[PDB]
Amino acid sequence: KHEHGVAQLNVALDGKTLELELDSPAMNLVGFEHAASTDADKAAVAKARAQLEKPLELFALPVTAGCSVASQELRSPLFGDADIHAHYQLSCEKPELLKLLTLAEFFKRFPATQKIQVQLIGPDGQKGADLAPASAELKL
Ligand SMILES: [Zn+2]
Ligand SMILES: [Zn+2]
Known part of the structure; x- marks a missing residue:
């Protein structure tokens, strides 16, 4: 799943928890x-x-x-002692306030990324969505 300027993001709101897994070809970052x-x-x-x-x-x-970080993992040789993997587990005191998810910021800070393919899995079920800097929100 390796296309320069295209990145996958899997999300999962499960009560308090929020898990973000970002797999991206290193070219974007x-x-x-x-x-x-x-x-x-x-x-x-x-x-x-x-x-x-x-x-x-x-x-x-x-x-x-x-929202506070419980654990964060950056799997790539480039950050040890080619793809990049970035796994965050977060713990939100008031997860009800997580109404919406803005990659707008991600795009600003890594403008090399033109499209982020998103697999969200709420307790509502499973929802896909392609995000570009133009259209970079996702109703959680
Ligand atoms: Zn490549
Ligand atoms: Zn991982």
């Missing part, structure tokens, strides 16, 4: 897939890393919701 030797390359990777380390900002989860 760092701007290449050759492991980083240069300094321009190493700063582009650390820029991405510290943006992905702040998932309440990227996914623009409302403050009103009481």
Whole structure:
């Protein structure tokens, strides 16, 4: 599932919990897939890393919701000691306030991404949705 500028995002609101799994070809986030030797390359990777380390900002989860990070995983060689995987588990005090999900912010911060294919699974059932910077909201 590897198309440059296209990323998959699986969501799952289960009571308090919210699980976001983002699989993306590395081209969208760092701007290449050759492991980083240069300094321009190493700063582009650390820029991405510290943006992905702040998932309440990227996914623009409302403050009103009481959202805190329980666990976060960035599977890629580029962030150890080519695709990128980014798994967040969140715990929202007031999950009822999570009415809507804005990738608008994600697009601003990784403008290399033109389309995000979204599999949401609520307690309502299962809903697909393609998101572009134009049309980047999803009724949760
Ligand atoms: Zn590629
Ligand atoms: Zn994972």
